[PDB]
Design a protein around this nucleic acid. Structure first.
Lengths: 341, 36, 50, 187
RNA sequence: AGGGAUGUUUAGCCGGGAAGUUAGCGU
RNA sequence: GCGAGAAGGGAAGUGUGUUUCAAAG
RNA sequence: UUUUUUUUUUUUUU
């Protein structure tokens, strides 16, 4: 009964008792502030010697760890507001957000983000907002992370972050929809990340999008489907476009992160070979006809044949992307073309 | 006066059209003055 | 429509006196005082475009 | 019957009087200057009866309960409430008053008064407010906002907008104009 | 290594108003 | 913001009233 | 001295 009796009794009394206090005149109410400053016996005396209204309410909120007590805490909050004894601050917004979470009430948490700026000064902590995104993913509901992202983005108060853009992308590709439908929605968020201040996503962003891009329809259209497309132009065009976006982004990222027959691999210093994997893809054609349609990679793939890059005797990359290759795009691709041939 | 003259023009050029746009104010709205 | 039915043309309305207006049953005190004000303003051209 | 008297938020508990006024039993035609305004076709006293204490069962309590002010209708949203949700607290923006949907102008006992012109048988120059300094005492319905008041000309577009004015400097940054109703701005 | 770090209570006089109080002769 | 006892007989005997004069906040 | 402020002001030492 240590977790049931001693827990409910302590919280019930604290709020009940507090209510009665307010009934007395203002002369018997708790001070707003902790204490007087130095301006108003050693300097350590005073300052922090009295219990504030705010401090008492937040102290009793540490007892909740169930859904039943979550409602109870709200009761106390209202009292302060109605009596004009609440001072919004950074701390206030932080604990409130977290209190819902600790009570196993994710539903209520989301509501806060759309109702904080109406009655509060400071926004919640960035950490908290990010953590709630993973909550939905663990339960298996990737469709509930689209509305939360938009509200944050639209809001001006909250500072824009590059990291925040990663979560969104990752969650959309896991939706339980068709291959073409899932990718189409993901591209919309990507696009949005290039207009408003031309944000630069991390280096490990373009890789993910590109992985599935040239695998879900491109690869599929030349393996079993053309047995003896409707957006073939867009798929190919977007493939290369993605790559381009990465180049521009990565170059500008290094300047602010840490204030840094024909070939061009003779006097090019020692760059990272990790990126050459995606750029080494051979362009077959726009259409099925690979011989009569299009007339415009070995030398590119000669840098790493045995799956051994110039890592041990080359340069060092900071916060690089996945080192691994394309199992579902390289291993099963070349073999088929050869073995079957 | 040596290096005194160049400063105020630099701040004036960077100065916005508006005087002071105080979006957020913690204390009570007032105005202080001195008499040397 | 009841008030308009009693009258025949505009001439009979502009030149209508106060006693004649009381004969009609479909006319209250508020309506009577309002109609007399409009006819007096249009005749003098005081209400072309307020 | 009249609504019971209630105290607004941010006020200590008071002691209710036994009679509405001194001449309760003796006289009946006398009326107090601070009489409540609840009959349809009137407006509240701003900071006397506009925001009475709000209470609800434990079950109904939630985050959304606190956000009632910010979701009020257009016909009851004041300046204070409007500026709270705008970027930068509505700073560096323009505001104007639209006197077209007042409660007394459509409904009320004296809703058929005789005007000097009579009846309405059928681009304007509306004032513009530029909030400079913002200070919130009792959020979200209380603040001491100081801004520059000027005149501006409306456009020919379907909605009420402000083309290339404000033009004239009327007065230095002063107190707000009105606290009844306000509109958005271009910013 | 940024999903980091940093931020936290301002002071005195006078005038008017509401609730509680309505005990004082020590000047 | 301004006006509102416009429905008052409850008090008083040397009082309430009347008369003669005076009054540049 | 304590809640309320759409009636104010003041703060330095060669």
């Amino acid at each position: 009964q240590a977790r049931e009796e001693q827990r409910r009794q302590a919280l019930k009394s604290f709020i009940s008792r507090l209510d009665d206090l307010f009934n007395l005149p203002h002369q018997q109410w708790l001070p707003l502030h902790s204490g007087a400053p130095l301006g108003a016996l050693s300097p350590t005396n005073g300052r922090d010697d009295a219990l504030s209204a705010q401090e008492a309410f937040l102290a009793a909120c540490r007892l909740a760890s169930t859904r039943g007590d979550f409602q109870w805490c709200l009761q106390g909050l209202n009292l302060l507001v109605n009596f004009g004894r609440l001072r919004p601050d950074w701390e206030l917004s932080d604990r409130l957000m977290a209190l819902s979470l600790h009570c196993r009430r994710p539903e209520q948490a989301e509501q806060l983000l759309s109702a904080f700026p109406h009655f509060l000064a400071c926004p919640p902590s960035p950490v908290l907002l990010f953590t709630l995104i993973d909550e939905a993913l663990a339960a298996g509901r990737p469709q509930d992370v689209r509305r939360i992202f938009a509200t944050m983005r639209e809001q001006w108060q909250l500072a824009l972050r590059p990291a925040f853009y990663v979560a969104a992308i990752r969650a959309m590709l896991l939706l339980p929809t068709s291959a073409d439908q899932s990718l189409k929605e993901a591209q919309l968020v990507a696009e949005d990340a290039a207009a408003l201040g031309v944000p630069l996503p991390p280096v490990a962003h373009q890789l993910l999008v590109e992985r599935a891009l040239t695998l879900f329809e491109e690869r599929l259209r030349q393996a079993d489907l053309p047995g003896d497309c409707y957006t073939t132009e867009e798929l190919l065009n977007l493939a290369q476009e993605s790559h381009n976006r990465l180049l521009v982004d990565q170059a500008r990222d290094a300047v602010r992160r840490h204030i840094s027959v024909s070939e061009l691999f003779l006097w090019n210093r020692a760059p990272n070979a990790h990126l050459l994997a995606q750029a080494a893809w051979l362009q077959w054609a726009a259409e099925r006809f690979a011989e009569r349609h299009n007339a415009d990679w070995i030398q590119l793939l000669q840098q790493s044949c045995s799956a051994s890059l110039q890592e041990l005797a080359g340069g060092i990359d900071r916060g690089s992307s996945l080192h691994r290759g394309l199992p579902p795009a390289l291993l099963a691709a070349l073999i088929r073309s050869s073995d079957a041939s | 006066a040596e290096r005194q003259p160049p400063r105020p023009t630099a701040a004036a050029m960077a100065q916005e059209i508006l005087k002071r746009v105080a979006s957020m104010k913690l204390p009570v709205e007032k105005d202080g003055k001195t008499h040397w | 429509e009841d008030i308009a039915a009693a009258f025949s043309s505009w001439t009979d309305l502009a030149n209508a006196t106060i006693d004649v207006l009381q004969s009609v049953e479909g006319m209250t005190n508020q309506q009577r005082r309002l109609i007399v004000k409009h006819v007096r303003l249009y005749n003098h051209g005081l209400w072309p475009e307020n | 019957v009249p609504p019971p008297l209630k105290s607004g938020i941010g006020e200590p508990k008071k002691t209710g009087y036994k009679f509405p006024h001194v001449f309760f039993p003796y006289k009946s035609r006398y009326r107090s200057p601070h009489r409540q305004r609840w009959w349809p076709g009137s407006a509240p006293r701003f900071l006397l009866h506009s925001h009475p204490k709000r209470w609800a069962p434990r079950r109904d309590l939630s985050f959304a309960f606190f956000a009632f002010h910010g979701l009020k209708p257009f016909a009851e949203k004041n300046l204070y409430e409007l500026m709270h949700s705008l970027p930068l607290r509505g700073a560096s923006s323009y505001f104007w008053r639209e006197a077209d949907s007042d409660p007394w102008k459509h409904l009320g006992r004296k809703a058929n008064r005789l005007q000097a012109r009579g009846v309405r048988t059928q681009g304007r120059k509306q004032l513009v407010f530029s909030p400079r300094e913002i200070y919130y005492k009792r959020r979200p319905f209380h603040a001491l906002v100081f801004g520059r008041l000027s005149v501006g000309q409306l456009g020919a577009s379907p909605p009420e907008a402000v083309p290339p004015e404000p033009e004239r400097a009327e007065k230095p940054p002063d107190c707000e104009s009105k606290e009844q109703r306000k509109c958005a701005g271009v910013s």
